[PDB]
């Protein structure tokens, strides 16, 4: 049983498992609400007499 094979296999496995353990999940989603800028009422025309 040539020894040099298993050393390479073990190194590959260790590198892979260490690469899989650094990946982290961290999202930065923003909320769905709006801003609601200012507004003013609009008055409709009418008539007046007495």
């Amino acid at each position: 049983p040539n020894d040099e094979a298993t050393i390479k296999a073990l190194d590959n496995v260790i590198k892979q498992i260490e690469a899989l353990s650094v990946i982290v999940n961290r999202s930065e989603k923003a909320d769905d609400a709006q801003i609601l800028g200012p507004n003013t009422y609009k008055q409709l025309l009418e008539h007046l007499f007495s």
């Binding site: 050393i7 073990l10 190194d11 260790i14 260490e18 353990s21 650094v22 990946i23 982290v24």
Partner: protein, 50 residues
């Protein structure tokens, strides 16, 4: 520091090993350190006797 006392300070030997980001386990860090260290060490005594 004084008479009949001698201090054996510890000095870092091998500076590899990367922390586990998943933070689930502590033994995985030690396993990584040991495996990489002995992968380096076994390359110095491939077919050699002291």
């Amino acid at each position: 520091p004084e008479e009949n006392v001698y201090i054996l300070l510890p000095i870092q030997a091998y500076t590899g090993g990367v922390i586990d980001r998943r933070d689930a386990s502590f033994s995985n860090f030690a396993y990584s350190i040991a495996s990489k260290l002995m992968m380096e060490l076994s390359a110095a005594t491939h077919n050699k006797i002291f």
